[PDB]
């Protein structure tokens, strides 16, 4: 109910996403005849469903960020190892790009070593 203080509901934040995503396609996905006359009516519904979808999305985002903050202030070693692995991957990618550029320059100089025809 609207004026009631207690919130009698549960089991959300997981099934809610799939529910919202599937449900507001109903205008499209439906095994029912479609009356070939409608305008400026189906709009408000899809606006509302994108609204609720981004809302629950933001909710999930905030929940994930709060969990990450709690685990970081709880287990900093995990975040340290994560940052270490990320830095290792970044260094590996940088080295790979450097090697690619080196091979490219090598090929480029090798092909036109004798660019001059004759003298």
């Amino acid at each position: 109910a609207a004026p009631g203080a207690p919130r009698p509901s549960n089991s959300t934040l997981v099934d809610e996403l799939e529910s919202s995503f599937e449900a507001c396609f109903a205008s499209l996905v439906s095994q029912d005849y479609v009356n070939g006359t409608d305008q400026e009516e189906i709009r408000t519904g899809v606006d509302q469903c994108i609204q609720k979808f981004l809302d629950i999305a933001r909710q999930t985002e905030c929940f994930f960020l709060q969990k990450r903050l709690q685990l970081s202030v709880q287990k900093p070693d995990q975040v340290i190892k994560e940052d270490v692995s990320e830095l290792r991957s970044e260094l590996q990618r940088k080295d790979a790009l450097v090697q690619k550029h080196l091979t490219k320059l090598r090929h480029w100089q090798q092909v036109l070593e004798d660019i001059n025809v004759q003298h």
Partner: protein
């Protein structure tokens, strides 16, 4: 002969531009790479 050596430089010039092109790509290929370093 002049015309001949014209080609000798002309394509060469193009080659240089091609080099630049490749270099430019390489240039760009490193610029984003410069972003990654969080020093």
């Amino acid at each position: 002969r002049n015309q001949q050596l014209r080609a000798l430089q002309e394509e060469c010039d193009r080659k240089l531009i091609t080099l630049r092109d490749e270099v430019s790509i390489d240039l760009y290929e490193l610029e984003e790479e410069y972003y990654s370093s969080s020093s």
